[PDB]
Design a protein around this ligand. Sequence first.
Ligand SMILES: *[C@@H]1O[C@H](CO[C@@H]2O[C@@H](C)[C@@H](O)[C@@H](O)[C@@H]2O)[C@@H](O[C@@H]2O[C@H](CO)[C@@H](O)[C@H](O)[C@H]2NC(C)=O)[C@H](O)[C@H]1NC(C)=O
Ligand SMILES: *[C@@H]1O[C@H](CO[C@@H]2O[C@@H](C)[C@@H](O)[C@@H](O)[C@@H]2O)[C@@H](O[C@@H]2O[C@H](CO)[C@@H](O)[C@H](O)[C@H]2NC(C)=O)[C@H](O)[C@H]1NC(C)=O
Ligand SMILES: *[C@@H]1O[C@H](CO)[C@@H](O[C@@H]2O[C@H](CO)[C@@H](O)[C@H](O)[C@H]2NC(C)=O)[C@H](O)[C@H]1NC(C)=O
Ligand SMILES: *[C@@H]1O[C@H](CO)[C@@H](O[C@@H]2O[C@H](CO)[C@@H](O)[C@H](O)[C@H]2NC(C)=O)[C@H](O)[C@H]1NC(C)=O
Ligand SMILES: *[C@@H]1O[C@H](CO)[C@@H](O[C@@H]2O[C@H](CO)[C@@H](O)[C@H](O)[C@H]2NC(C)=O)[C@H](O)[C@H]1NC(C)=O
Ligand SMILES: *[C@@H]1O[C@H](CO)[C@@H](O[C@@H]2O[C@H](CO)[C@@H](O)[C@H](O)[C@H]2NC(C)=O)[C@H](O)[C@H]1NC(C)=O
Ligand code: NAG
Length: 245
Amino acid sequence: TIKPNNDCRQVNVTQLDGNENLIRDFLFQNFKEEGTVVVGGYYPTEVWYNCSKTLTTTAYAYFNNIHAFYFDMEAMENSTGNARGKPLLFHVHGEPVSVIIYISAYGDDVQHRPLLKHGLVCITKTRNVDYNSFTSSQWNSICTGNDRKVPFSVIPTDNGTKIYGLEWNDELVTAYISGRSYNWNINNNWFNNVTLMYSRSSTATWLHSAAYVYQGVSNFTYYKLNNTNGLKTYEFCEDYEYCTG
Ligand SMILES: *[C@@H]1O[C@H](CO[C@@H]2O[C@@H](C)[C@@H](O)[C@@H](O)[C@@H]2O)[C@@H](O[C@@H]2O[C@H](CO)[C@@H](O)[C@H](O)[C@H]2NC(C)=O)[C@H](O)[C@H]1NC(C)=O
Ligand SMILES: *[C@@H]1O[C@H](CO[C@@H]2O[C@@H](C)[C@@H](O)[C@@H](O)[C@@H]2O)[C@@H](O[C@@H]2O[C@H](CO)[C@@H](O)[C@H](O)[C@H]2NC(C)=O)[C@H](O)[C@H]1NC(C)=O
Ligand SMILES: *[C@@H]1O[C@H](CO)[C@@H](O[C@@H]2O[C@H](CO)[C@@H](O)[C@H](O)[C@H]2NC(C)=O)[C@H](O)[C@H]1NC(C)=O
Ligand SMILES: *[C@@H]1O[C@H](CO)[C@@H](O[C@@H]2O[C@H](CO)[C@@H](O)[C@H](O)[C@H]2NC(C)=O)[C@H](O)[C@H]1NC(C)=O
Ligand SMILES: *[C@@H]1O[C@H](CO)[C@@H](O[C@@H]2O[C@H](CO)[C@@H](O)[C@H](O)[C@H]2NC(C)=O)[C@H](O)[C@H]1NC(C)=O
Ligand SMILES: *[C@@H]1O[C@H](CO)[C@@H](O[C@@H]2O[C@H](CO)[C@@H](O)[C@H](O)[C@H]2NC(C)=O)[C@H](O)[C@H]1NC(C)=O
Ligand SMILES: *[C@@H]1O[C@H](CO)[C@@H](O)[C@H](O)[C@H]1NC(C)=O
């Protein structure tokens, strides 16, 4: 789904520390009964992407023809207290409205930013966005004018064991955070592509690091879910005709 890029490598998302049950908990969010079911949808698979650059040059990655975007972070420092975040910005394109997700770094030392709220949603009608100004300015003057600015908290006490996600169609947007999902009714023409800024130089809101993995989902995926005596297992169906027959 990603454009070719020498900075981006493939990684098994489950084998990273704290990610043993990352995909398991997402699949069983809605299946609460006992027994078996085969579910289809825009679910994440095993192999994700880690994009990083040792030099402090601004770098971008592009995902095309995707319906969903998921990402995962490492555990924050001092997660139970004054948690210090790591930065990540991406932009879901559409007309006449597009969406920018920005997660800033550092802690309570960022001026004017509400306490323990590292996440920002900018709903904007701007056609061309200057990401350098967005990620280099003071937090109070970032997403202003006619844009809609929504601060939100990641859950630092989750320690990066839960998946973060976004799915969209032309009538509804769904956000996945912690073990919960939020719905947003909006009529829009999404372009089905995402721009991601994974590295730049340190600023008042950005810290040079590589702490995220991400995946864009474009194809319909099938999982077989089995709940036996409270033991929850899953299997990725390569073809639907095999696991169901
Ligand atoms: C992702 O992992 C696979 C397989 O990992 C194995 O199964 C996991 C559940 C866990 O137990 C791992 O420790 C296991 O190794 C990797 O594919 C393996 O690659 C090695 C080294 O080249 C090779 O000897 C094995 O035969 C491969 N196994 C299979 C089943 O093909 C794969 O490299 C990882 N993908 C990445 C890092 O992108
Ligand atoms: C780890 O963070 C704790 C907790 O920070 C406090 O709570 C946060 C949610 C936020 O509101 C911070 O501003 C708070 O300070 C730190 O412990 C606090 O340290 C301050 C230092 O001025 C002190 O006044 C508080 O009493 C402490 N609160 C406690 C102990 O409950 C702690 O220092 C951090 N550890 C690091 C950064 O290593
Ligand atoms: C996230 O990690 C933190 C820090 O490792 C965990 O906080 C600890 O929780 C245990 C209970 O298992 C307490 O006894 C410790 O005192 C806590 N450590 C602190 C406050 O420094 C936290 O439980 C983890 N959250 C999860 C796993 O959801
Ligand atoms: C995301 O997709 C949209 C829609 O396909 C792309 O917008 C088109 O881009 C081409 C090439 O620059 C232009 O010629 C078209 O006029 C655009 N169509 C529009 C705006 O409706 C957009 O470029 C894609 N973005 C990325 C980063 O791939
Ligand atoms: C993504 O991969 C990079 C390397 O490509 C990882 O960062 C490296 O971490 C090791 C161990 O701390 C260091 O020796 C390297 O210098 C780091 N490289 C860079 C460019 O920072 C990074 O941890 C990976 N991200 C994950 C797993 O989330
Ligand atoms: C769901 O998983 C459970 C546990 O792995 C499976 O139940 C086991 O099935 C095997 C062979 O069918 C039996 O030998 C075991 O005794 C069963 N375990 C228990 C605790 O009953 C079950 O078959 C799986 N479900 C499906 C539909 O494949
Ligand atoms: C996604 O599905 C399309 C269906 O046309 C197929 O051509 C493509 O190879 C699939 N991609 C992956 C990564 O499975």
